[PDB]
Amino acid sequence: MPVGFIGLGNMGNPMAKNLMKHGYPLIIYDVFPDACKEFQDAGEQVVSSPADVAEKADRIITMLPTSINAIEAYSGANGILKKVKKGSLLIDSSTIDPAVSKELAKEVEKMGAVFMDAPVSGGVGAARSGNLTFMVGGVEDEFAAAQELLGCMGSNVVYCGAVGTGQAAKICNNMLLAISMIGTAEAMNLGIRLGLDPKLLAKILNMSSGRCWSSDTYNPVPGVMDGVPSANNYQGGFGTTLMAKDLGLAQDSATSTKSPILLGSLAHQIYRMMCAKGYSKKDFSSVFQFLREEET
Amino acid sequence: MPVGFIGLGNMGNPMAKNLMKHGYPLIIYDVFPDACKEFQDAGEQVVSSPADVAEKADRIITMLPTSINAIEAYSGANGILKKVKKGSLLIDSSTIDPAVSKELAKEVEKMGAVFMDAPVSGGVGAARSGNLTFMVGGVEDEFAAAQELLGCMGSNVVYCGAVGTGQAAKICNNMLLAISMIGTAEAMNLGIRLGLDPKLLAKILNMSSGRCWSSDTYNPVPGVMDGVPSANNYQGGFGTTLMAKDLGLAQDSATSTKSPILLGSLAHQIYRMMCAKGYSKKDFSSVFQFLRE
Amino acid sequence: MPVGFIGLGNMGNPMAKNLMKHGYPLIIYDVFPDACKEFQDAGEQVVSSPADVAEKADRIITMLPTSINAIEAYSGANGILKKVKKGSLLIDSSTIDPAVSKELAKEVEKMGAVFMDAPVSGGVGAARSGNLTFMVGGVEDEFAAAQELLGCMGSNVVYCGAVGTGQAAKICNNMLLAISMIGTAEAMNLGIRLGLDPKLLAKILNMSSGRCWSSDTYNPVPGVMDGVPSANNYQGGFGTTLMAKDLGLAQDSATSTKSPILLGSLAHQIYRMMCAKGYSKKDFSSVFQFLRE
Amino acid sequence: MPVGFIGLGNMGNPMAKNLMKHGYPLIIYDVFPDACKEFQDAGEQVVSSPADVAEKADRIITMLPTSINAIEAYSGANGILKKVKKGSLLIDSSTIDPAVSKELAKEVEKMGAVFMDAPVSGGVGAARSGNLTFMVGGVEDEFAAAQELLGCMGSNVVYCGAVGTGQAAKICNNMLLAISMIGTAEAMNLGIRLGLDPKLLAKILNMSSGRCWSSDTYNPVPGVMDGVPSANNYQGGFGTTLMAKDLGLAQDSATSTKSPILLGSLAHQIYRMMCAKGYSKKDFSSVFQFLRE
Ligand SMILES: NC(=O)c1ccc[n+]([C@@H]2O[C@H](COP(=O)([O-])OP(=O)(O)OC[C@H]3O[C@@H](n4cnc5c(N)ncnc54)[C@H](O)[C@@H]3O)[C@@H](O)[C@H]2O)c1
Numbered sequence A: 001m002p003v004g005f006i007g008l009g010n011m012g013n014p015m016a017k018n019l020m021k022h023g024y025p026l027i028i029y030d031v032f033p034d035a036c037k038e039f040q041d042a043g044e045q046v047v048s049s050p051a052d053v054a055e056k057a058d059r060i061i062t063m064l065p066t067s068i069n070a071i072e073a074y075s076g077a078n079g080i081l082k083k084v085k086k087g088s089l090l091i092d093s094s095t096i097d098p099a100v101s102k103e104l105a106k107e108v109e110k111m112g113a114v115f116m117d118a119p120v121s122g123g124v125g126a127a128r129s130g131n132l133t134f135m136v137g138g139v140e141d142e143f144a145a146a147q148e149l150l151g152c153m154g155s156n157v158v159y160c161g162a163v164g165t166g167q168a169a170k171i172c173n174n175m176l177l178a179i180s181m182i183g184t185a186e187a188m189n190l191g192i193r194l195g196l197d198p199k200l201l202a203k204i205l206n207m208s209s210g211r212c213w214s215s216d217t218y219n220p221v222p223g224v225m226d227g228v229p230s231a232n233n234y235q236g237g238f239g240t241t242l243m244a245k246d247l248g249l250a251q252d253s254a255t256s257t258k259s260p261i262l263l264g265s266l267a268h269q270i271y272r273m274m275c276a277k278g279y280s281k282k283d284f285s286s287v288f289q290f291l292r293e294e295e296t
Numbered sequence B, C, D: 001m002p003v004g005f006i007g008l009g010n011m012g013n014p015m016a017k018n019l020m021k022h023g024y025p026l027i028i029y030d031v032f033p034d035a036c037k038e039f040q041d042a043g044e045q046v047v048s049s050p051a052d053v054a055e056k057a058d059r060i061i062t063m064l065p066t067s068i069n070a071i072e073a074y075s076g077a078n079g080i081l082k083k084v085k086k087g088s089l090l091i092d093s094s095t096i097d098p099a100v101s102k103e104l105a106k107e108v109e110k111m112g113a114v115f116m117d118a119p120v121s122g123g124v125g126a127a128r129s130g131n132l133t134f135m136v137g138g139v140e141d142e143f144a145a146a147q148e149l150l151g152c153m154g155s156n157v158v159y160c161g162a163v164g165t166g167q168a169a170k171i172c173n174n175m176l177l178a179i180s181m182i183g184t185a186e187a188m189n190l191g192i193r194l195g196l197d198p199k200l201l202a203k204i205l206n207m208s209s210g211r212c213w214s215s216d217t218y219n220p221v222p223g224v225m226d227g228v229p230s231a232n233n234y235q236g237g238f239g240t241t242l243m244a245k246d247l248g249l250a251q252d253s254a255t256s257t258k259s260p261i262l263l264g265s266l267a268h269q270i271y272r273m274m275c276a277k278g279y280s281k282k283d284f285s286s287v288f289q290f291l292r293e
């Protein structure tokens, strides 16, 4: 019973592969055609557009970079909504503006289908293993159905409320993360410059009120925690570019809902600075490197 | 074998009581005399100055508000250093500027005594139960001795390095808390205004990369968590005034060490505002009230 | 030769009046109908919708609050673009998102008309006297035509580039204004609290590298300058609500163009908080009153 | 009638030269001895310490980098106060912590001399020409005397109040400058990236509510204005190191007076970072370079 997948990059590729592990035939499409080559070999069908995915697939998933990509993929001249069938389940696991999710939801429900935002927590690793967290928004009746499908790609699938709530939950956590990580980087930098041994300061933080996931699970000072991007030149990880994108969404939503985010705004600008300054492909925890003094 | 205690407020009072529970005679002093009244009843000796505590006590503890108070309590005209005895152990568990800790350390070591900064993590509750964390700085040989004494008032006593490193650790930790608490607050306020139930957003933060002490142990959003100040109009707890003082210490250390603290600076200024806008006596998680429309 | 005017609030009312002073018949429309009553008395024609202004007016001006208002006024079910005539000149002097200006520009050009964003500098006063500055974007050949019309309402009309550049010019200015006003407020408060007389600190600021329009022309500290809003409890002036709206524009355009605006972002949030804390109707210079204890 | 001058760097050298232009014999000292070599050739006396300046000079001026330097130059083992004479006039035109100015003032007054803080506005250019602004604090009777002397080096000499008020004034002006300059840079960077022509955007800023000294006299965008550091790769001018120093003085005063400074703090932190990143030897207007992609 076929499943449609549109967009097969860093999260999409392994996500799409796990659906094949659980035994689903896929109808693939991607605007970068090289990205599909691997799937045509696996036995799966590659098509020429989103509309052509919809014409053959009763329920579809979309893992695209940002809002304009989803607007295009769905509403475009050769988009999904041009040939989506009655009662179809469309799931967008991209991270995009919630307002845009609702807009798409209105246009899908106009077509007699169901739409659900389902952005993801966890990176390329969790994507492969299948331990991603899905934050799901939409008509609650349909959540049962979506859980069946999303559970193949992920270990946690949480209902967040109406369409848009999934994006809002993703965006809020990333903002807190962004803030806490820059904070850890600063507390750590100040302490080291005050004479403390990083390993000990990190200990003190991690047993006190300062403790957070940044300090205890993703520590940005090299030589403190093994297994994290700081141990490995901040390679791979979750990309500064993406942190900045997600922060940018938080800024858009903060402004529109007239929500003051003092620390969040600055987190956004710091990451935006980092991207213009050669950190864009480095892990977001490399904010510590950015704070840390250069020699003369 | 007598122990000297100078400064008996919110942390000092219960700390001093726990030393009595483990069976130490106390030589009490406080510039606010009413604060002593309770101890003169318990059988303890109240004196007229710090110098007079030092004249009678071989090892002393000081729990004072900030730097100027410690500078006065020690170096003052009738301060400790006027009558401290050879080989005495002086411990300052105030949260003050590290630089000032070193300056006192130099003046104590001049007098042939030992000084150690030992600021505390945990609030009034931990103080009473005796589960405070002490972050201790000073000459490492002396740490053994200090652990013996501090362990009566606290459950964790950690060596941080040379004199000043304890204040360094307390100050830094409080900055991360402030940044994170305001962070959690901004995040929850955002999500609520985007139409999320707070109990569900907290769940998500807490099973995710956002998780931190502020969000999973001290949530600032009324009705999310039992047994926290947001459950009770932000009474008690750790006060905005004190938070703001501590972040001031961070700001000044950051300046002195030339360390960029962008968020830390905002955190400082936000709590300074709250002190001016009637939050001074509320718990610092009340920053969420301050952002909430 | 008729001129269409949509939206007659604080800037719109006096702008519309100055076009009557130079001798133009007006075709008025406003979603708040009481706002029109004054013009039906002057002899001018009030209509039921923007579309109905278009049906009667060869060149139209729109002075609306923000983006969605322009999007609706033009593209709406009974909007301008429903009945606009070949070769018409449409001028939007609202302050809105540049991106939205371009979008309307494409939609107007599709209908064989000309569109031009022409936001304004100067307040209600400049509006009345006719000394507003217009920042104008659009196809440069059409600038001559627009200057003829806008010059009735304003004393300076400057070409900024393609459609969107006017909004981008207004938005960047109001961002620098906001940053500098909060700066002046902060600097003055710091000096006052450091024991300076405010009038002296202003003298110094205004003869030195700190001088800016905020300090030498619109000074936020009551009693430093006569005739500025701070001399009359921040009544009238340029509204805190609108400044936040404009800073929201800067913010969202900074995001879209990936432009780091650190102080700018803070300015936005500070003004955001003021709206929620009882400054929304007060002049934007009231940030001083908001900082002061 | 001899004048003592201690510290002959970027401001000191030309200041000291203007005193020679008005015809004063100078008794020079500087911890960097090469800095003196030029004055030994002019006929002036170089000495081996501040104390040795005081032994020969009835009224002295000190143009040093920061607080510790003044503390040392005055109170040091071979400092001024070791051999200052009755009724002498000591003037410190360094930019330092006001609290430290008062401390010195008390120590000078104890020795029967007068002390006056007199920090300066205007850079290396105004220094040479003699158009610097002096902001003067101290006992008001003595202001007459100091004006006679300072007027040789500067065109404006303003009384600010008691000792420390000069520093107070310098420090709040510079904080406002930092905020506006970063503001301008942010404003200009955002306009450019929204596609404006810079020369135009500056024109608009400079005829609108955004206008300020930063944008109309010292515009950081290369090629908008002639004559400013941004025309010459940000060489010379007013160094990022010193701006960061002055904003550290604002910050520490801001904390000490419990004054909220959200933007001044950010300003401080930005300039801090720029010093960490090889902007230190560059004029402070180089903040535009730093934000720009
Ligand atoms: N990478 C991570 O560690 C991580 C973690 C959590 C969440 N996310 C979120 O997941 C989303 C995508 O992650 P990713 O790293 O796989 O992105 P990606 O860019 O690597 O993959 C997206 C793919 O979509 C394709 N695409 C773009 N527009 C399209 C269109 N109109 N039609 C068809 N295909 C199109 C691109 O060719 C690309 O291969 C983002 O929104 C991101 O915020 C990423």
Ligand SMILES: NC(=O)c1ccc[n+]([C@@H]2O[C@H](COP(=O)([O-])OP(=O)(O)OC[C@H]3O[C@@H](n4cnc5c(N)ncnc54)[C@H](O)[C@@H]3O)[C@@H](O)[C@H]2O)c1
Binding pocket: B006, B007, B008, B009, B010, B011, B012, B029, B030, B031, B032, B035, B063, B064, B065, B066, B069, B070, B072, B073, B093, B094, B095, B096, B120, B121, B122, B123, B124, B237, B238, B239, B242, B246
């Ligand atoms: N309150 C908390 O939850 C908490 C937690 C950890 C650390 N701290 C830190 O511990 C320190 C004290 O906290 P607190 O709430 O007990 O303060 P407090 O005001 O409640 O207690 C201070 C006491 O010291 C006295 N005092 C002031 N100057 C004195 C002097 N010169 N000589 C003798 N006594 C003097 C005061 O009269 C008062 O009784 C602070 O530095 C604070 O930041 C507090």
Ligand SMILES: NC(=O)c1ccc[n+]([C@@H]2O[C@H](COP(=O)([O-])OP(=O)(O)OC[C@H]3O[C@@H](n4cnc5c(N)ncnc54)[C@H](O)[C@@H]3O)[C@@H](O)[C@H]2O)c1
Binding pocket: C006, C007, C008, C009, C010, C011, C012, C029, C030, C031, C032, C035, C063, C064, C065, C066, C069, C070, C072, C073, C093, C094, C095, C096, C120, C121, C122, C123, C124, C237, C238, C239, C242, C246
């Ligand atoms: N007020 C000032 O001092 C000042 C100064 C310079 C620039 N501005 C800018 O001018 C713009 C508008 O200023 P204002 O004070 O006139 O705003 P305003 O709110 O006072 O007036 C706008 C009017 O438009 C009407 N309106 C709203 N939606 C409409 C619609 N869809 N169709 C037709 N009419 C509609 C409203 O009823 C209202 O009366 C803002 O973007 C602001 O930034 C204001």
Ligand SMILES: NC(=O)c1ccc[n+]([C@@H]2O[C@H](COP(=O)([O-])OP(=O)(O)OC[C@H]3O[C@@H](n4cnc5c(N)ncnc54)[C@H](O)[C@@H]3O)[C@@H](O)[C@H]2O)c1
Binding pocket: D006, D007, D008, D009, D010, D011, D012, D029, D030, D031, D032, D035, D063, D064, D065, D066, D069, D070, D072, D073, D093, D094, D095, D096, D119, D120, D121, D122, D123, D124, D237, D238, D239, D242, D246
């Ligand atoms: N540079 C400017 O455009 C400008 C403008 C206004 C105000 N200021 C203020 O002026 C002050 C100094 O300005 P500058 O640019 O000449 O600095 P500078 O570094 O060029 O000059 C300082 C001089 O004093 C000497 N010195 C340092 N410590 C000494 C000591 N203990 N005893 C004797 N000499 C000592 C140094 O060797 C140096 O020659 C600063 O405090 C700054 O904020 C500078």
